[PDB]
Amino acid sequence: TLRAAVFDLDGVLALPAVFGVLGRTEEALALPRGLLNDAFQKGGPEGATTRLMKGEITLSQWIPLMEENCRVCLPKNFSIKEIFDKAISARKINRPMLQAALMLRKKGFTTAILTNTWLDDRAERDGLAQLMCELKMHFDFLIESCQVGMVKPEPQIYKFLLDTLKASPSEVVFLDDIGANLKPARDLGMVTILVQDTDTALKELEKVTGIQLLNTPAPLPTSCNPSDMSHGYVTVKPRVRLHFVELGSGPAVCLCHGFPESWYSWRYQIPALAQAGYRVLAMDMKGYGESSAPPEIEEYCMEVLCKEMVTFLDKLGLSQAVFIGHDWGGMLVWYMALFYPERVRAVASLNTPFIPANPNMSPLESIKANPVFDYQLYFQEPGVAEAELEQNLSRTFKSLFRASDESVLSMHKVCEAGGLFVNSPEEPSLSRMVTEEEIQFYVQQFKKSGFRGPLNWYRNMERNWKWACKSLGRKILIPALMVTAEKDFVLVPQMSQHMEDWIPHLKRGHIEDCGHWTQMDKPTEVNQILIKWLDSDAR
Amino acid sequence: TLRAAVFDLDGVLALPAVFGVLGRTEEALALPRGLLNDAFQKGGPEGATTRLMKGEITLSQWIPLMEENCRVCLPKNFSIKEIFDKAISARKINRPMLQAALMLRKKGFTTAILTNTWLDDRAERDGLAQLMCELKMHFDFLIESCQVGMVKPEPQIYKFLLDTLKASPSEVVFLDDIGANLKPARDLGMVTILVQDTDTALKELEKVTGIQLLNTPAPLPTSCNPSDMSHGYVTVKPRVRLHFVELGSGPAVCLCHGFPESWYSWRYQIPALAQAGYRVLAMDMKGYGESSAPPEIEEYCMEVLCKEMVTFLDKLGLSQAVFIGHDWGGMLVWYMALFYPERVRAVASLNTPFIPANPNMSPLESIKANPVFDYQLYFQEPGVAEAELEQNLSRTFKSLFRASDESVLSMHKVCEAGGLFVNSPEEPSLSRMVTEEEIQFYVQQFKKSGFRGPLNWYRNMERNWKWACKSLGRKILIPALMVTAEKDFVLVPQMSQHMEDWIPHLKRGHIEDCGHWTQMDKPTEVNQILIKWLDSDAR
Ligand SMILES: Cc1ccc2nc(N)sc2c1
Ligand SMILES: Cc1ccc2nc(N)sc2c1
C-alpha cells in the first residue's frame, strides 16, 4: 500500500515549465525548431547544464556558457538572461496540484518535492526564493539536485529519495512531466505518473491512492502549528511582558484578539497575510496566554492597554503598524486610532463597531438597555464568572466556540439564570469550526492565568467612558475598515450603521452566515477582505 | 542642587521650528508681516490651535479651521496643508541638544521632553512618528500637551511636570525657545534657559549644571539594554531553538557573532541599523546564550549551521535576509552566500576573509603552517579549553576583550605554554572597550552552556573542508562587503588580498587602529561602513 508521494517542481507543482518557454522563444523569434532546447542540453552528463543542476556552478556563471552553446545566425538583441528571467518570473504554483499534495499529507502520506534545480544568484533571485518558501512549507522533504550533487535521471538520486522517505519503492507514487526522469523510478518499482495536464494526472493519482483529490470541497486556508512559529516577548513595564507570534516581511500588521481568546484565534490569517506581503505580529493580549496577567482591574482599562501597545511598538522599533482587532481587540484598535493616529498605519475591526461614548448616560445604564449585553453585567462581580469559566476549560471553549447553527450560547437573562453555561450540556459536542486538538491548545493556554485578567477587560466601564469622552470632538481620518458578521447576535451589523458620521472615509466588509467567532467561522472570506483592504489602503 | 532637565521639542530638540516657517512663508509670498502667525494663534485660549494642542481635535480637523482664520487677499494656489507638510518634513533632531540631554542622563539626571503638540492623522504622519520614536527613547519621560489635555503656558502642566519628575522646582532646569512658556516655570522656582542659538543655550546649561556639555569628545553610538529588547525564539529542529533580538522595520539584516560572543556583541550596531531603516535580527548563534547548545561536535559543522539558519528564515517567513558576520559568524555568512544565494540579499564580513578550501592539503596542515592559528590546535582536544575558559568567566572575558594597545592575549605557542591565559593576570584590568556591567552580561550568558558548543565550531575542520570543496567551481556574485581591521593580528587584512578572484564585484571597508573585537573597538566606524554599504547595495 502507498504511503509516500513525490512531486517534481517544473511542470508539476509549478506552471508553465521552462521547456515550455524555450520552444515558445524559438517560435516567437522564428528560429529553427529545438535550437534553444538543444543548446540547453548540450554535452549531456558532461555539459554546462548538468554542472549547474549538480551545484558545481551557479546560474550567473551558467549564463555565458549557455550563450556559447547557442553560438542561421541568432538575432541582434538576443539575451539568454532576459529569456530565463521572464520564464522563471512567469512560473507560478499549480494550485490544484498543491491542493492534492496537501490532501495526501492530511491523510497520513509522507510528501516530498524532488527537483533538478540550480543555485540562483541572479539580482532577481528573490522571486524564486519566495516561490520555494511558499511551496516547501507544505511538504515533509525538499530534495534539490544542486544541494545533493546528484540529478534525475541518475539512479543514485532515487536511492537517496527512498533513504530520506524511509520507504520501500512500492510504497511511493512519483509524479513527473519528463518521461526520462520517470523511467528510473519505475525500474525501481515505484508507482509513476506522467504529468501532461493536471486534471489527468490527478485522476491517475486518485485511482492509485484511493483518496478523492479531484472535485473536492473548498479547502480551509493554511493554519499555524504553535511549535513551528517564531515567538516574541517584549517587556512593556516592570511586571508586564507581551508575547506575540511573528511571520512574514513587509509592513507591520498587529492582530489583536477578543475575549476569551489567543494569538491562535488568528491561525488562518497569519500564513495568508504573511504570504500577501506583510509582517504579521499576532498578540497574546494582556491577561492571556504567554503575556503577563496582573490581577488588578485598573491594569485592563483601555488607556493603559493602549499605552502598553504604544510601548510595544517603541521597543520593537516600529514607528507604525496596521491594527486589526476582533471583539475586545476591535475596541482597542478603534481607541489606538483615536489616541495614537501617528502610530496607526490603518485600522480594521471585525464585528466591534465604533460607537462614541455618550456623555449624558453612565455606561452601566447603556449596557442595561440592551438584553443581548446581559453577559457583560454577569462579568462585573469579581470571582463569579472566573469560577464558572475555570471549572471545566474543555467545556468552556467547546460551549463558546460554535458556528451560528450549532446551538450557540444564549446571552439574555445570564444573570437571572445564574451563569453562561447553566442551560448548556456538561460534555458539549465539538463544533465544525474546531478540532479537539485546537480546543486543547486553548485549554493549555488558559491553565496559566485563567480568566481574571481577561474578565477585567469588561471591568473598566466608567474608567473607559471618562477616557473616551476626551475624544468626543475627534474624527477617525486614517484608513479604516469595518467588517460586519451577519449572525453575530451580540455585535450585530446594525450597531455599526452610524460609523460614517465619525469615520467619513470608512471602508466596509460584510460576511454572511458568520457568527461571533469570525476568523475561524469564515477564514477564507476574512482573508479575502483583509488582503484586498491592506493592498489598497495600507500599502 | 539640580537633578532633572526638561527640554521643549520645537526649536530646542528639533530644528528649524514651525514659528520659523510661517514667517518665511509670509516673506516668500510677500504677505503682510505676522499674518500667518496671527491666524495660527487666533482666539488664544479659546481658539482652534489651543483645541488642537489639548487633543480636543486632530491635525486633519484643524487644517480647515486654520484656513478660515487665514481668510490683501491671499494668493490663487494657497494651501495650509502644503505649508505645514513641508515645515514638519524639514524639522530634524538638533544633534548637539540631544547629545547634551544624553550626557546629563548619563551623569544621573532625570530627563524629560515637555511639548505642545498635536494628534497627527495626516497621510504623511509617519515622518513625525519616526522623529518622536528616535527622540523619546533617550528620555525618562515624554509629556505631550494633546495627551495630557493641558498646554504651556497654563500653570497646571508645570505642576503635572513636577509631579511626574518627583522633584522640587529648584532641582529642575527647563529649556524653551518661547519666553511666555518659560515664564510659568521661572515663577515656580525652576532654573530656566531661553533657547535662541544652541551653543549659547548649552553654555548656560553647562554653567548651571557644572557638567561639560560643549566641546566634549565624540560620543559612542547608542547601545542596547537587554531587558528593553524584543526577544525572539524559533525552534529549527526538535532539540534546537535559536534566540535573537529584533529591532526596526525594513529589509531583514541578520547579525552573526563570532567566538566566544553573543547577540550583545552587536549592541552598538542594533540601534544604528534599525534607525537607518532596517529590521535587525541579532542572533545568539547555536551553542550560545539563550540558543540551544547540544554537546555533539557534528552539530556545529558549517553544513548543519547553515541549514539551521535557512530553517530559521523559513520559520520567520523571510525569503531573504542580508547576512553580516564577524569571526566564526563571518565564516558562516560566506558559506550562506555560496550554498544558499537565493536566501542571501547581500553578505558582509568583519575580519574573516573568504579563502577557498585547498583540495590538495588537509585543513590541519594549513592551520599548522601559520603560527598565529596555534590557538585553534589548542581548541581541538575536547575538555582542555572548556576547563581553562570556564574556570573564571570574568577573567576569561576581561582577558579576551581588549583593544590593540591593551596587552592583548598572545596567540603563538598556546599549546607549548599550555593554555590561553597561562601568562595572563588572575585579575585583568578592565578594557576601555567594556564596562564591568557589560563583562557581567557575558559572564551570565556563559553560565548556561559554557564553552563546549562554542568550541565545537573549531572542531569540524575536516567536515567543513569536504563540504567547502563542493563549492570550488563557484563564485560569489551577490552583493558582498569585506571589512578589514588593521590590528587584528590573527585575521590580518592581508589574508583577504585574493578575495576578488572569487568575488569579482566585492566592495571593501577598512578600519585603522582596530583589533579583533571590531564592533566594540570601533563602533562608530563599523556603523558608518555598514550603513553606507546597506543603503547602496542591499536596498
Ligand atoms: C464574549 C461573547 C460575545 C458574543 C458571543 N456570541 C456567542 N454566540 S458566544 C459569545 C461570547
Ligand atoms: C578567537 C580570537 C581570535 C583573535 C583574537 N585576537 C585577540 N587579541 S584575542 C582573539 C581571540
Side-chain angles (χ1 to χ4, degrees):
Chain A
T1 222
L2 297 165
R3 58 172 276 257
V6 186
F7 300 80
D8 183 21
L9 169 78
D10 200 62
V12 178
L13 284 165
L15 293 174
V18 179
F19 201 123
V21 152
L22 285 191
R24 267 195 283 267
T25 308
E26 281 159 16
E27 274 207 0
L29 298 207
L31 296 154
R33 296 204 176 268
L35 210 207
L36 295 189
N37 273 308
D38 116 76
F40 187 78
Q41 86 121 74
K42 211 183 192 81
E46 292 106 314
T49 302
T50 298
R51 289 186 77 211
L52 171 74
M53 297 299 191
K54 283 189 183 190
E56 300 183 25
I57 58 159
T58 78
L59 192 65
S60 293
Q61 292 177 283
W62 173 96
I63 304 299
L65 305 170
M66 177 55 27
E67 250 122 16
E68 293 151 25
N69 286 335
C70 277
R71 171 251 157 178
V72 237
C73 258
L74 294 117
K76 199 201 194 211
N77 282 55
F78 208 55
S79 181
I80 283 299
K81 172 94 218 296
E82 292 170 339
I83 290 148
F84 281 90
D85 280 341
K86 205 191 269 88
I88 294 152
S89 201
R91 198 174 58 169
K92 307 255 265 180
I93 287 175
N94 178 358
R95 305 284 170 184
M97 188 67 69
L98 177 59
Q99 178 181 197
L102 257 7
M103 186 74 253
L104 291 177
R105 207 184 184 206
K106 202 179 137 204
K107 293 276 166 67
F109 273 64
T110 289
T111 63
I113 305 166
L114 170 62
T115 176
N116 279 0
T117 192
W118 54 84
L119 294 174
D120 202 334
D121 55 352
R122 286 176 303 124
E124 311 86 345
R125 73 202 172 272
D126 194 43
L128 189 130
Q130 283 176 237
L131 176 98
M132 293 312 298
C133 208
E134 189 181 3
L135 268 172
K136 74 190 282 191
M137 71 185 49
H138 302 298
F139 294 83
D140 293 289
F141 304 100
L142 168 64
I143 305 166
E144 296 176 311
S145 70
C146 58
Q147 280 296 311
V148 301
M150 294 182 271
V151 293
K152 292 185 302 182
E154 306 176 323
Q156 54 196 348
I157 202 165
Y158 302 83
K159 289 278 186 176
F160 182 83
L161 169 69
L162 294 166
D163 186 47
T164 117
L165 293 172
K166 299 181 184 175
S168 323
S170 82
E171 293 180 310
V172 187
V173 219
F174 189 104
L175 296 89
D176 204 312
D177 67 317
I178 297 171
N181 299 341
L182 202 66
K183 196 167 90 166
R186 195 184 301 111
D187 296 354
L188 225 45
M190 292 186 227
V191 178
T192 61
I193 295 162
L194 178 64
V195 180
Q196 281 180 25
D197 61 299
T198 302
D199 240 274
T200 306
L202 298 185
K203 288 185 198 95
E204 285 183 46
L205 189 55
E206 201 168 55
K207 199 93 84 187
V208 82
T209 61
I211 297 167
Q212 175 169 285
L213 304 159
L214 226 36
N215 313 317
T216 236
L220 285 168
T222 300
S223 187
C224 289
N225 179 185
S227 64
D228 286 326
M229 308 311 291
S230 180
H231 288 266
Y233 304 82
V234 171
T235 297
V236 292
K237 70 165 145 271
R239 293 185 76 190
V240 187
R241 157 192 101 169
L242 296 174
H243 163 253
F244 63 101
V245 152
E246 189 176 39
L247 186 76
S249 59
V253 181
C254 185
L255 307 183
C256 303
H257 69 76
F259 176 95
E261 307 185 57
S262 170
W263 68 266
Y264 193 65
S265 287
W266 300 103
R267 63 198 176 273
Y268 295 112
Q269 284 70 54
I270 298 156
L273 294 183
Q275 188 50 51
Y278 298 91
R279 173 187 177 180
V280 179
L281 309 157
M283 312 298 301
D284 262 337
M285 303 301 284
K286 191 186 190 168
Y288 293 90
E290 299 177 55
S291 292
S292 298
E296 301 83 7
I297 288 166
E298 335 68 79
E299 279 292 295
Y300 303 85
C301 72
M302 289 280 111
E303 187 174 6
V304 346
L305 291 167
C306 283
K307 271 171 167 70
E308 283 164 0
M309 287 306 297
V310 168
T311 301
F312 177 77
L313 294 179
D314 289 341
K315 293 204 190 180
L316 261 164
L318 300 179
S319 57
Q320 294 186 323
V322 357
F323 278 85
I324 304 180
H326 168 255
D327 181 78
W328 262 112
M331 195 79 270
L332 179 283
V333 289
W334 290 129
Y335 285 90
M336 287 296 291
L338 279 169
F339 286 82
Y340 300 99
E342 40 282 279
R343 304 298 215 117
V344 181
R345 217 293 97 201
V347 58
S349 178
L350 307 185
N351 310 44
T352 313
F354 175 63
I355 300 166
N358 180 359
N360 296 313
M361 217 195 287
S362 295
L364 262 170
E365 288 180 66
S366 312
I367 277 133
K368 276 207 176 77
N370 199 327
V372 304
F373 300 158
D374 191 59
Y375 77 100
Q376 302 205 13
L377 302 170
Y378 172 71
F379 288 177
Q380 295 306 304
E381 185 58 32
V384 180
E386 283 90 334
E388 197 195 10
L389 293 159
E390 285 164 20
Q391 197 276 128
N392 182 340
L393 298 171
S394 184
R395 180 176 182 238
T396 289
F397 296 106
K398 282 177 187 180
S399 308
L400 285 168
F401 304 160
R402 301 194 146 272
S404 54
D405 55 276
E406 304 177 316
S407 321
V408 296
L409 282 170
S410 78
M411 261 136 308
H412 62 70
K413 290 159 180 183
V414 171
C415 296
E416 201 181 284
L420 259 320
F421 315 128
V422 297
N423 293 291
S424 172
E426 271 288 328
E427 268 169 6
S429 56
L430 183 69
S431 165
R432 60 94 170 153
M433 298 199 304
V434 288
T435 65
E436 181 59 38
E437 290 65 48
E438 290 168 332
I439 290 293
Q440 292 311 302
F441 177 83
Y442 287 88
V443 172
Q444 291 308 296
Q445 292 298 291
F446 284 79
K447 268 173 187 181
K448 181 198 168 190
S449 308
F451 290 78
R452 185 173 181 166
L455 286 155
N456 284 349
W457 283 69
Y458 291 93
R459 294 175 182 154
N460 286 283
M461 297 181 11
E462 201 83 2
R463 207 159 236 144
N464 296 341
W465 173 80
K466 283 176 160 277
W467 188 62
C469 283
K470 303 190 197 311
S471 77
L472 287 173
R474 305 180 200 155
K475 280 187 182 183
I476 293 174
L477 302 163
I478 69 170
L481 174 71
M482 174 68 206
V483 185
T484 50
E486 181 193 16
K487 286 167 184 163
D488 184 332
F489 302 120
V490 174
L491 304 176
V492 309
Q494 175 80 314
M495 282 179 63
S496 79
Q497 79 184 313
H498 305 297
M499 286 177 65
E500 286 86 348
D501 298 350
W502 320 105
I503 316 172
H505 318 293
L506 184 70
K507 294 214 179 173
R508 287 177 180 271
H510 181 75
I511 315 183
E512 289 177 311
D513 204 50
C514 188
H516 180 69
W517 317 96
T518 316
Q519 305 103 299
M520 60 171 134
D521 195 325
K522 291 287 173 287
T524 301
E525 21 291 287
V526 165
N527 293 356
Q528 177 256 313
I529 291 163
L530 296 182
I531 293 159
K532 176 193 166 186
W533 171 76
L534 285 167
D535 288 343
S536 67
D537 292 64
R539 301 239 68 257
Chain B
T1 222
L2 297 165
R3 58 172 276 257
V6 186
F7 300 80
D8 183 21
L9 169 78
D10 200 62
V12 178
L13 284 165
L15 293 174
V18 179
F19 201 123
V21 152
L22 285 191
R24 267 195 283 267
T25 308
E26 281 159 16
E27 274 207 0
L29 298 207
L31 296 154
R33 296 204 176 268
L35 210 207
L36 295 189
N37 273 308
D38 116 76
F40 187 78
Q41 86 121 74
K42 211 183 192 81
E46 292 106 314
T49 302
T50 298
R51 289 186 77 211
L52 171 74
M53 297 299 191
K54 283 189 183 190
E56 300 183 25
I57 58 159
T58 78
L59 192 65
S60 293
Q61 292 177 283
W62 173 96
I63 304 299
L65 306 170
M66 177 54 27
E67 250 122 16
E68 293 151 25
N69 286 335
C70 277
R71 171 251 157 178
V72 237
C73 258
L74 294 117
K76 199 201 194 211
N77 282 55
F78 208 55
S79 181
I80 283 299
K81 172 94 218 296
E82 292 170 339
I83 290 148
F84 281 90
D85 280 341
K86 205 191 269 88
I88 294 152
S89 201
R91 198 174 58 169
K92 307 255 265 180
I93 287 175
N94 178 358
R95 305 284 170 184
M97 188 67 69
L98 177 59
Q99 178 181 197
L102 257 7
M103 186 74 253
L104 291 177
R105 207 184 184 206
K106 202 179 137 204
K107 293 276 166 67
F109 273 64
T110 289
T111 63
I113 305 166
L114 170 62
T115 176
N116 279 0
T117 192
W118 54 84
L119 294 174
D120 202 334
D121 55 352
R122 286 176 303 124
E124 311 86 345
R125 73 202 172 272
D126 194 43
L128 189 130
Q130 283 176 237
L131 176 98
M132 293 312 298
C133 208
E134 189 181 3
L135 268 172
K136 74 190 282 191
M137 71 185 49
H138 302 298
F139 294 83
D140 293 289
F141 304 100
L142 168 64
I143 305 166
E144 296 176 311
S145 70
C146 58
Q147 280 296 311
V148 301
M150 294 182 271
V151 293
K152 292 185 302 182
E154 306 176 323
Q156 54 196 348
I157 202 165
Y158 302 83
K159 289 278 186 176
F160 182 83
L161 169 69
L162 294 166
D163 186 47
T164 117
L165 293 172
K166 299 181 184 175
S168 323
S170 82
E171 293 180 310
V172 187
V173 219
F174 189 104
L175 296 89
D176 204 312
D177 67 317
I178 297 171
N181 299 341
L182 202 66
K183 196 167 90 166
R186 195 184 301 111
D187 296 354
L188 225 45
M190 292 186 227
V191 178
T192 61
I193 295 162
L194 178 64
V195 180
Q196 281 180 25
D197 61 299
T198 302
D199 240 274
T200 306
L202 298 185
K203 288 185 198 95
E204 285 183 46
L205 189 55
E206 201 168 55
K207 199 93 84 187
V208 82
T209 61
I211 297 167
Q212 175 169 285
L213 304 159
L214 226 36
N215 313 317
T216 236
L220 285 168
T222 300
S223 187
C224 289
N225 179 185
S227 64
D228 286 326
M229 308 311 291
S230 180
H231 288 266
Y233 304 82
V234 171
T235 297
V236 292
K237 70 165 145 271
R239 293 185 76 190
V240 187
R241 157 192 101 169
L242 296 174
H243 163 253
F244 63 101
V245 152
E246 189 176 39
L247 186 76
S249 59
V253 181
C254 185
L255 307 183
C256 303
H257 69 76
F259 176 95
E261 307 185 57
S262 170
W263 68 266
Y264 193 65
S265 287
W266 300 103
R267 63 198 176 273
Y268 295 112
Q269 284 70 54
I270 298 156
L273 294 183
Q275 188 50 51
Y278 298 91
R279 173 187 177 180
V280 179
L281 309 157
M283 312 298 301
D284 262 337
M285 303 301 284
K286 191 186 190 168
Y288 293 90
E290 299 177 55
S291 292
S292 298
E296 301 83 7
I297 288 166
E298 335 68 79
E299 279 292 295
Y300 303 85
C301 72
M302 289 280 111
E303 187 174 6
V304 346
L305 291 167
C306 283
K307 271 171 167 70
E308 283 164 0
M309 287 306 297
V310 168
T311 301
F312 177 77
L313 294 179
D314 289 341
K315 293 204 190 180
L316 261 164
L318 300 179
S319 57
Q320 294 186 323
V322 357
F323 278 85
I324 304 180
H326 168 255
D327 181 78
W328 262 112
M331 195 79 270
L332 179 283
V333 289
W334 290 129
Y335 285 90
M336 287 296 291
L338 279 169
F339 286 82
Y340 300 99
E342 40 282 279
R343 304 298 215 117
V344 181
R345 217 293 97 201
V347 58
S349 178
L350 307 185
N351 310 44
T352 313
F354 175 63
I355 300 166
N358 180 359
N360 296 313
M361 217 195 287
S362 295
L364 262 170
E365 288 180 66
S366 312
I367 277 133
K368 276 207 176 77
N370 199 327
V372 304
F373 300 158
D374 191 59
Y375 77 100
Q376 302 205 13
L377 302 170
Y378 172 71
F379 288 177
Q380 295 306 304
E381 185 58 32
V384 180
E386 283 90 334
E388 197 195 10
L389 293 159
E390 285 164 20
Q391 197 276 128
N392 182 340
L393 298 171
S394 184
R395 180 176 182 238
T396 289
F397 296 106
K398 282 177 187 180
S399 308
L400 285 168
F401 304 160
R402 301 194 146 272
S404 54
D405 55 276
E406 304 177 316
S407 321
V408 296
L409 282 170
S410 78
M411 261 136 308
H412 62 70
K413 290 159 180 183
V414 171
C415 296
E416 201 181 284
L420 259 320
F421 315 128
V422 297
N423 293 291
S424 172
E426 271 288 328
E427 268 169 6
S429 56
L430 183 69
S431 165
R432 60 94 170 153
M433 298 199 304
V434 288
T435 65
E436 181 59 38
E437 290 65 48
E438 290 168 332
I439 290 293
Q440 292 311 302
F441 177 83
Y442 287 88
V443 172
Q444 291 308 296
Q445 292 298 291
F446 284 79
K447 268 173 187 181
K448 181 198 168 190
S449 308
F451 290 78
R452 185 173 181 166
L455 286 155
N456 284 349
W457 283 69
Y458 291 93
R459 294 175 182 154
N460 286 283
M461 297 181 11
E462 201 83 2
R463 207 159 236 144
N464 296 341
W465 173 80
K466 283 176 160 277
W467 188 62
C469 283
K470 303 190 197 311
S471 77
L472 287 173
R474 305 180 200 155
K475 280 187 182 183
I476 293 174
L477 302 163
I478 69 170
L481 174 71
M482 174 68 206
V483 185
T484 50
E486 181 193 16
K487 286 167 184 163
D488 184 332
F489 302 120
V490 174
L491 304 176
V492 309
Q494 175 80 314
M495 282 179 63
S496 79
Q497 79 184 313
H498 305 297
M499 286 177 65
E500 286 86 348
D501 298 350
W502 320 105
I503 316 172
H505 318 293
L506 184 70
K507 294 214 179 173
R508 287 177 180 271
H510 181 75
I511 315 183
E512 289 177 311
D513 204 50
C514 188
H516 180 69
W517 317 96
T518 316
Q519 305 103 299
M520 60 171 134
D521 195 325
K522 291 287 173 287
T524 301
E525 21 291 287
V526 165
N527 293 356
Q528 177 256 313
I529 291 163
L530 296 182
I531 293 159
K532 176 193 166 186
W533 171 76
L534 285 167
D535 288 343
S536 67
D537 292 64
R539 301 239 68 257

